[PDB]
Amino acid sequence: YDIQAWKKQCEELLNLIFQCEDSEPFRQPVDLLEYPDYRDIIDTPMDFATVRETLEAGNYESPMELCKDVRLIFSNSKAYTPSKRSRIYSMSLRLSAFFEEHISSVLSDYKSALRFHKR
């Protein structure tokens, strides 16, 4: 029932994501010089360095907020892909499965801890 435990758990999961080869296209903001129409398709760019920085700055109140930003990385990849068979989009689907597999217990533990706090 540790209300704060999610933060270190998210730091560790981000470290695992950074060591994954599938995260390479998502580690830094999408290069607007290489994809000049990116902002015509994507309203809110997101990447894993921005997520890690937001977490380290103490600018996430809960793992749900972190999860919303990570999911935005994947939805942006899906929205920008010209094909569901593209390399970057295919990497995003594997990385998303890995993320969802690991974030589930973090969210469950946090919500359980908060319910215990308000019992």
Ligand X SMILES: Cc1cc(Cn2nc(C)ccc2=O)on1
The 32-61 site mask, x for binding ligand X (CB under 6 A), equals: ---x--------------------------
The distance of closest approach from Cβ of residue 62 to ligand X in the complex, given in angstroms and rounded to an integer, is 25
Distance (Å, whole) CA 93 – CA 95 = 5
23 in contact with ligand X (CB under 6 A): no
Which residue type does 6 have? W
> Which tokens sit at 101?
């597999």
Residue 26 engages ligand X in binding (rule: CB under 6 A): yes
**Count of CB atoms situated within 10 Å of the CB of 71:** 15
Classify 20 in phi/psi space as left (phi over 0), alpha (psi -120 to 50) or beta: beta
Spatial separation of the C-alpha atoms in residues 62 and 4, rounded to whole Å:
9
Sketch the per residue contact string, 62 through 91, with ligand X: x for CB under 6 A, - otherwise: ---------------x--x-------x---
| Piece of 23-31, 51-59, 97-105, 107-115 that binds ligand X (CB under 6 A) | 23-31
